[model samples]
Target chain A: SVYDAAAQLTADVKKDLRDSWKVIGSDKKGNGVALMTTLFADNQETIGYFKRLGDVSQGMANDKLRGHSIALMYALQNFIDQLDNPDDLVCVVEKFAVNHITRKISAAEFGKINGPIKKVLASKNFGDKYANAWAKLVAVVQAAL
Target chain B: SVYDAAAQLTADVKKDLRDSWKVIGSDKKGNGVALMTTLFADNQETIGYFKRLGDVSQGMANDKLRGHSIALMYALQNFIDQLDNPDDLVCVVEKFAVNHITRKISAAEFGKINGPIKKVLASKNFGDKYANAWAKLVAVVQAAL
Candidate 1:
């Protein structure tokens, strides 16, 4: 079961996740803005969904867009906080999925964020172990979504 | 000077701010959404500034709005984390103020959020001590704005 898979995250992996998150999440707004900027740059269709954010090509100074980016990181932070508690983790992810589903945002659209997330982590030089740990956590989250 | 005021936050007051923040900020999305909801309800003009959020009368399930709420909380989180470092705190607030000024969001418009923030803190029953501490911190941030 997906829940079991989530629970199976090794203790070492959880440590890696937390360690990496501490650095990445420290500057939530800056990192989040960067992540959104990259995501928008890579995927025009995705950026279209947030047309209300004005022109992203110029910059990410828009408070609304910056807020969205910070919120995205906060959501990930919430999920990471629950890594040791699989039941709660699944519940949180389901809640998130339901919110998006209600807004007609497809899973494919939701998955587009993972690429930029990985890129940001790579930029931090957290190494392969951290990346693998992140992938495992993301996989479970995507499954729940 | 606003910088001196920010630096003047007593050790005890900083503890109250951070202590209360730990609880209010634990559920960033929920609290953020609630804060925004209350803000819109109390100040229709504020809601108007976020017209792109789509009819907020119904609910806050909108992803963009949710993201905005979360980001608002994260910004506060970032600010709080720098309480002991007044230079960085003032710098961060000025960065925020500049962003809003660029967006033509007036100081009055920005000030509208403090009421709801206080109300939310009251709802948490964090006590007058916490409330006063929050006010002290907010005053400095507002001064910078």
Candidate 2:
């Protein structure tokens, strides 16, 4: 189950990144990022996001997080500017901003949790919360793109 | 008008191939990827995709005839595997089938054409068709991931 969840989560993250990245540019970190090369980083609900992925890496992860942050910010701002309907996307961006800017995705990452869910199955089910956040990010990238 | 027409035509082709590649993983060549470099190569699209990238490559511009075709297949299929969506994403996967049984893409190189758009778009637009395709891909990946 852990395996399924991890696969799905990373897969979805990859897709989200890919989906958002395309248009102006369709991908990043060169072709095929090699499935994150042994769980160096991950994203959270953006609520506790800072606590989550903060400890997952060395300085490189921090830089990437920063880069992803800037890119995502640009994306959201752009969505608000362009979308036929920008209100919801704006709200979403604001929420993520609060979390990301506030926590810095450090707590969870700062300390270790229960058994590391490498390749977990529980994460398989797609939920609205995840989709909604992703959509907001998508909006951000779209507007910026 | 030429730009608009060209963009639309190429987008359409890309869209179709993307739809297909999600399921099929078109027979892409990895060995010659390097050979497709700037100055020389057999599949002209290889070199062209790079040159006219600003122009989306001259070869692709000519209806993306050669380079466009190659890129489109790769780009579109990448679309399915790399994007994020909450809806029925599997249909997109079933469309082309790019895995062990794929007729198109090689599992290893699929990342080359399909992975990491965010990493590449240092200075680009990343647009609607691209986004839409990405959305489609995301849907499928969410399920698989």
Candidate 3:
């Protein structure tokens, strides 16, 4: 199960997760905003779901986009916060699936965000350890979704 | 700031939060389903936002409603997961505000969920301590929104 996989993440990996998230997630307005900006830029299809934001070429300066960016980061933060407690983490992940499933968002479509997540992490100077840890977590989450 | 207030939640109160949430939040399909059920029942106006569910009076057996209930519970779980880390918690809370503000959900309207939250907690046999702790967190979250 997803919980078992999450539970198996090594302590060193968890440490990397904590350290990396501190830098990446600290700036909800800046980094968080950049994440969605990059996602929309890299994957145009995802933008259709957020048509209310209008044009994205000008960037995510709109309050609606900023709000969504912050919300997305916080959702990630929740996952990080529950890394040690896989039972709770599974519940959190399930919620993500449940919500998106209702929205007609397939796992493949949801997986599109991964590229931007990794890109943002790399841009923040986080190394492979951070990326690897995030990948492990994302794998579990995506599979469950 | 909201973070400051969240930081001041006592150890005992935090314990109450964790303990009570384990019960109220665990059964997303059941308790979570009931939460929105109770909310829509008590506040008919809120139902306008979820017109897709048709008539919720028949109960939230629809997959869409079930998905939404799970998602709602997971959001609450995230807040509980970050109880000790107020700085992160504040970010999560801000995301909630940002997303809802874009949707035109006023703080007063958002506060309507409090009654259902409390009622659910009470139904689960959670005591004043649990209610008080949840209230403390909700007050800070609501104020920020």
Candidate 4:
């Protein structure tokens, strides 16, 4: 019953996007996540509080998505890429955004990626949303450097 | 990014179900609410809370994925059909279950209906999840008697 309803919701979401919202399916990195979400839960109903923490330390924290993980990560990423490794992070995302000149990736797809990230940022719960966990994620990524 | 992660997470959950446990995805009808407890946030996850209400007041609590309003009404009709008539309110869902099987709707379809319902049931929120308010849904169903 849940799956069928999910399938219907997914189907209806696809319809809304194509007919009403009009978001193109293809993404910047050939990112299939957008296509998959539109295909799976079209309504964008529940964006999971997901986390992946690879490599750790003696006092490393049990990584999480409790709150502030997403926003902090994106904000930090946005802030830092503009500061430090501007080319790798900033230019890449900007290039991805610039992709619209060809209309190859529709505005819907190009602009949509930031919504969920912003939502997670605003929600104030990494376990339930994402905030500090994102900060930790960035720290983890940069730890190698 | 949240939806992106969720798509991948859903895939992973499905993969785990296919691999290890007897994961009956999306339970609105009281199967494996326990496993979901582990996956979804405690305060946020609402499936178990609503389902605890065994009584079906206000016509019926039709699940989205398990059955559309009409189909649920049909199922309810089939359930009440076994009773002496209204006012009596001698409800019987097992009979409807019996018919579902006799009609060859089978186990897989039952899950297909219930699973997706469970998934979105966990996802719906106002300034947040935007799948549309379903309350007026009762008004739109022409056959809602």
- Winner by DockQ: 3
**Rank by lDDT (best first):** 1, 3, 2, 4
State the C-alpha lDDT per candidate: 0.75, 0.33, 0.74, 0.28
lDDT of 2 by residue, B32-81 (tens): 12213222333343343344333433432232233223333343433443
Model 2: how many Å of interface RMSD? 15.7
Give a tens-digit lDDT track for model 3, residues A116-135: 87888889887676777887
* Arranged by TM-score, best first: 1, 3, 2, 4
Candidate 4 residues lying further than 4 Å off, grouped into runs, are A1-82, A85-90, A98-103, A106-109, A122-145, B1-145
lDDT of residue A129 for candidate 2: 42
Question: lDDT score, residue A87, model 3?
Answer: 58
lDDT, residue A36, model 2 = 28
- What share of the reference contacts is kept in model 2? 0.00
Report the number of clashing residue pairs per model: 0, 64, 0, 33
- lDDT at B138, model 4: 14
With a 3 Å backbone cut-off (N, CA, C), the pairs that clash in candidate 1 are: none
Q: Estimate each model's TM-score.
A: 0.59, 0.21, 0.58, 0.17
The residue-by-residue lDDT of candidate 1 on A1-145, one tens digit each, is 5576687688998998899999998887689889888988898887767775677775556756664665567678777877766655665666566557656777567777777778888899867777778877776756655
How well is each residue in B58-125 modelled by candidate 1, as lDDT tens digits?
Answer: 55556556656655676787678778777667656665666587668775667777788888888998
What lDDT does candidate 4 reach at residue A58?
12
Candidates 3 and 4 compared: the better one by DockQ is: 3
Give me the displacement of residue B25 in model 1, in angstroms.
Answer: 1.3
Model 4 residue B110 CA deviation (Å) reads 49
